[PDB]
Amino acid sequence: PFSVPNLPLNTLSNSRVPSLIRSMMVSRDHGQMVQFQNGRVTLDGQLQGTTPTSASQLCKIRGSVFHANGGNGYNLTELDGSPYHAFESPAPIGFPDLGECDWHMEASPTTQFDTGDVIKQINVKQEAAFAPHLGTIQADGLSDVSVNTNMIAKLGWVSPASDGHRGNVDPWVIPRYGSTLTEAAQLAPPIYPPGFGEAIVFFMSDFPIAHGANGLSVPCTIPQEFVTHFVNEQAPTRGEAALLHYLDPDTHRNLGEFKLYPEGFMTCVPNSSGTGPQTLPINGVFVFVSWVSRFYQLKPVGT
Amino acid sequence: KPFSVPNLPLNTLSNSRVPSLIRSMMVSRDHGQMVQFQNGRVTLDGQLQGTTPTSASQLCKIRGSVFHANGGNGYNLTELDGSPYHAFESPAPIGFPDLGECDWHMEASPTTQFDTGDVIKQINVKQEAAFAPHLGTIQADGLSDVSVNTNMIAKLGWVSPASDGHRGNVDPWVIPRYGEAAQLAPPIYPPGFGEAIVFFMSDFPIAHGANGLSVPCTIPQEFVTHFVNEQAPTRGEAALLHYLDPDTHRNLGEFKLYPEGFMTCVPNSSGTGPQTLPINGVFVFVSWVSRFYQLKPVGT
């Protein structure tokens, strides 16, 4: 039988950055379409895009240092050291999907070391030599690292694109992973609001962002622990949408009804002009009620 | 309601002490006699213990407000969500690192929106006299130019030998002195019957590590989350598990998972036990067994 985790939201992780869920929101300016590559899963537990099983794989890069044509970077592998297969995903599993910004990362050797001198503060820019789908990304801070040094890079913070094309970091934008004719076809597909007054629910987490469009806020379509739960359970999808209640376990009140679609995103009907689920407490738990049709009309949520 | 473990291959799961993928399983002659890790601590019926979080995203992070005191700067600690740290809950805030006797090199950033990376600080947390997480205070180098009462989240980057020189290596089997401290997860012992504790090993950036980059934990983080989610009553002295081969789906070895959240096997004479098993296998619950249930040896 289908289920969602019986765990309070505020103890769960964002599925795009390894940070606790701070709030829920709907978006008028950004909620018309998203194509996040992390936090992408079916309700029957098929991982999509670059989505990992574990939050510990999120926003990490692994590869071997190259020096070519006056530029330094990584020949990418998977985080476990196994080869990156370009037909399988648009980048290695857990590769960050924060588009059009600088990635300030800490890179360390994948072999035992004696001193912190082998630890490098690197900057990954999304410019001409950013080609994760082809298995190569440029990086500043690698000039003094020997060719073929195997390393793991962990995302610390992001800042506006070094080239000046965007004055802020927009956490709604995904990377351009490659430049081929069939490039958009290799991605986890776009997510649209489905109709019937429904808006996509975004789970917001704080991440270290210099000059963020929404300050520290990063949106995702499902908590990481929900991803893991679906992969674990492999529950057959038996309807067009899973009706959920958001319960307050402390007050024993039903706070709102929600719809979770086979494509792994959640909707609510925001009350009139409204912030919808943004005013709800963040320590509630989702519970599966039943399978419903796509046209099942939800009770409005919020003020 | 019925007891289960995740149907997830080990190599996709996280260490419960450091946010890194599981690389191997092992037993330990030198360190397997007693461990008291404070992270990765959970009952099979889903009670979190020590500083153990629900989410891997909470692991090895500290949150607090900068204070400046004569010759020493540090954090007044809170929980990672900004809510107050209660000593009646845990021996330190949830997700507090449990790598004892070593320097913590951490990246600290403001919890309020900022414009540039000049507010990002590289800090060093030493485990000396002013390291008092149970009292809700730690000292840190690298905070002299941060305004008092700046709220910050610090994330563990790497660890190195203690600044005071009392140890030449980082020993990942040693926990901090938190205090005495209320809510220390209790010691774990091998229970007899030829059984050795199974450690799930992950690499973390460690300068001069006793075992290089390798950090042991007693259970994968996703197992912790699964037990908290399921809240299955414990109906026996131990849960018999099979470790299944990924290609044949067949039994490679039997394990006992105890109510206290740790797992054991009987290593073959040779002695590497589960270390030679493939790391992309899955554990499956078989049945509840008695404490004296004698396991078939595992390994070469």
Numbering used by the authors:
A (entry chain A): 231 to 533
B (entry chain B): 230 to 408, 413 to 533
Question: Which lines from the publication concern this structure?
Answer:
Most residues of VA115 P protein were modeled except residues S409–A415 (in B chain), due to uninterpretable local electron density maps caused by the local disorder of this highly flexible loop region. The two P proteins exhibited the typical huNoV P dimer arch-like structure with the P1 subdomains situated at the bottom and the P2 subdomain situated at the top. These variable loops confer DSV and VA115 unique surface topology from other huNoVs. Therefore, the glycan binding pocket becomes narrower but deeper, which hinders the binding to HBGAs.
NoV VP1 can be divided into two major domains: the N-terminal shell (S) domain and the C-terminal protruding (P) domain.
